[PDB]
Design a protein around this ligand. Structure first.
Ligand SMILES: NC(=[NH2+])NCCC[C@H](N)C(=O)O
Ligand SMILES: NC(=[NH2+])NCCC[C@H](N)C(=O)O
Ligand SMILES: O=C(O)CCC(=O)C(=O)O
Ligand SMILES: O=C(O)CCC(=O)C(=O)O
Ligand SMILES: [Fe+2]
Ligand SMILES: [Fe+2]
Lengths: 338, 338
């Protein structure tokens, strides 16, 4: 069995999808422009029908932790070297694949970015940054990226996180875990459903991990409020037989002095640690991780820094953009508050 | 200006959409079968491109209370007489248009029904029922159907309510109103955002307005719990500059003894009453009402009972089916709890 839903493109289907993305790259200036943001969901209707059927059906299944699409061709010579930083990572060689990721994402929902993450970009980059090996952000390497709900601190966090592997020569594993419902006793479950936990914003939302500019500066103040004064929230929500999950192994805490909540979180930690499994995104594989059913991370790896490091394109997806309307900057798709 | 977003099909576009719906009616046994429920969203990708662009873009706009599509051809001779009851309302003449409504709905989200409403049907019927002129349900006529959020009692209520006019010879108006934000003072607004109100299920969820059978019987018990023991909820949620609305003019009440909450609800009533406007769905018009931004109703009218009464097909749409997973019966798209 597999805890995720998987689809493998035929070479013909993969070529057709690539051709469509290349056409988009020819017609539009960038992926994050207002034009392509609006058009991509409709252009995505031209993708191979079997893939559209998979994405429409698999999203509605009750069980999978992710939707995985294998077999998108990538030519390393055409792609070029892995960027040394996300700032300069919008290379011409990676451009068609960025368009491709957004097309696939459009079949699942409304894409968006954060003003406080990688300069408000919608399509972001995951790659190892020299000197940042032992950090809590996606550009880490030597230190394992601990399991987490994406942007757990925020009520506007994605429903799906898309990851497209541009290259991964050494097969470094993405980690995943669902709610450990087979082992959570009812008392512990009861406590996890109560608003007795604190969840602060991760380090990617700090100014230090963004470019030196006034572009999207006011949104960093809302990150500070979330870090300094986190209101108590629940870890589990919804149906007790299939709960949605909101937790971060490195940024979650119990409400101050609440030892019963602490015990529940401690138990949850051990159960997620013990059930954590691996998904290897080989070059050309795309995963859309269900950010409500599963937490995810990335195994520790030794970075190369020789031009062929592991490199993913990444995108946040929500089923309903209007859920985050308080955090809207304007007509843009870049979220944040004060 | 218009408070809703409007689209008029060209005759060619309308004919193409009709042709697609007719093809679906030929290929599938019914609209509510598991097959067409799953396929309709992908088949909808074959609708006229200008319409798909409208639906993709208009849904993301911040302002409209509804998305209105004009100009679907309807032949009264082909359609046949208006049914005397919803039970027998799945007539061959109305079948293609039911498929059409579901195709359009598939562009906006996941369709669903309620076990306690019209025998769990996904595509439901709005028509006057003889002897039921002065009721609080959609089959009323002589008594105005007061403004309401659809299924306000439930946290699984639709994001969009679709209404397709099969006929409306006397131009009876659907009523609509947004949040009266131009007139709500901040104190009143503050109170409406607090969990100080009760909202009970409407009369369409009662057993008396469903067929005599054991089909979907356990779900009526959850309706009783909502009616007997309503937990306090808010009327307004989300962004204060653009709140989402949850209210029913005939089923909302303040929390017991809460006079400040009562004052706020009383004020809201008068402001919605005063700002209520009309939308006439002529034969062939389809409206997708934003059930979070607007309340809606229907003007009082004199029923004919001569075979040509006003008749709509209706459908509930959610942006995320998994929001209601506690209320899932099984793999079906019919909601309810105990
Ligand atoms: N436990 C954690 N490391 N949480 C933060 C995860 C990494 C973060 N989502 C980023 O893009 O950098
Ligand atoms: N205030 C009201 N009348 N609320 C109930 C509205 C009618 C209900 N949605 C039905 O289908 O019959
Ligand atoms: O590198 C990976 O596979 C996971 C990256 C990740 O968790 C993130 O960017 O949020
Ligand atoms: O008849 C109309 O136009 C409105 C019907 C309605 O409000 C409903 O069926 O929920
Ligand atoms: Fe992540
Ligand atoms: Fe209604």
């Amino acid at each position: 069995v597999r805890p995720w839903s998987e689809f493998r493109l035929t070479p013909a289907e993969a070529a057709a999808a690539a051709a469509l993305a290349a056409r988009c790259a020819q017609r539009y200036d960038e992926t994050d422009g207002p034009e392509f943001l609006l058009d991509a969901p409709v252009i995505a209707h031209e993708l191979p029908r079997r893939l559209r059927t998979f994405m429409a059906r698999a999203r509605l299944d009750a069980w999978p932790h992710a939707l995985v699409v294998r077999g998108n061709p990538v030519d390393d010579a055409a792609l070029g070297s892995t960027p040394v930083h996300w700032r300069t990572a919008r290379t011409p060689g990676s451009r068609p694949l960025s368009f491709l990721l957004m097309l696939y994402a459009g079949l699942l929902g409304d894409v968006f970015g954060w003003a406080t993450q990688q300069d408000g970009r919608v399509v972001t980059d995951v790659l190892p940054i020299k000197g940042g090996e032992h950090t809590l952000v996606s550009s880490s390497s030597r230190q394992e990226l601990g399991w987490h709900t994406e942007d757990a601190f925020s009520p506007y966090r994605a429903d799906y996180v898309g990851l497209l592997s541009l290259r991964n020569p050494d097969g470094v594993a993405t980690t995943l875990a669902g709610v450990p419902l087979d082992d959570l006793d009812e008392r512990t479950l009861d406590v996890l459903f109560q608003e007795r936990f604190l969840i602060r914003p991760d380090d990617s939302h700090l100014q230090v991990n963004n470019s030196t500019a006034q572009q999207g500066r006011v949104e960093f103040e809302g990150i500070a409020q979330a870090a300094d004064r986190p209101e108590p929230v629940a870890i589990l929500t919804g149906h007790r037989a299939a709960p949605h999950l909101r937790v971060d192994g490195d940024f979650s805490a119990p409400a101050e002095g609440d030892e019963e909540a602490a015990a529940a979180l401690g138990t949850l930690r051990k159960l997620i640690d013990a059930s954590l499994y691996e998904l290897v995104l080989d070059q050309g594989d795309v995963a859309f991780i269900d950010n409500r059913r599963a937490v995810h991370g990335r195994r520790a790896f030794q970075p190369r820094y020789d031009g062929r490091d592991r490199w993913l394109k990444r995108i946040n997806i929500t089923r309903d953009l209007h859920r985050s309307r308080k955090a809207w900057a304007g007509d843009s798709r870049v979220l944040g508050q004060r």
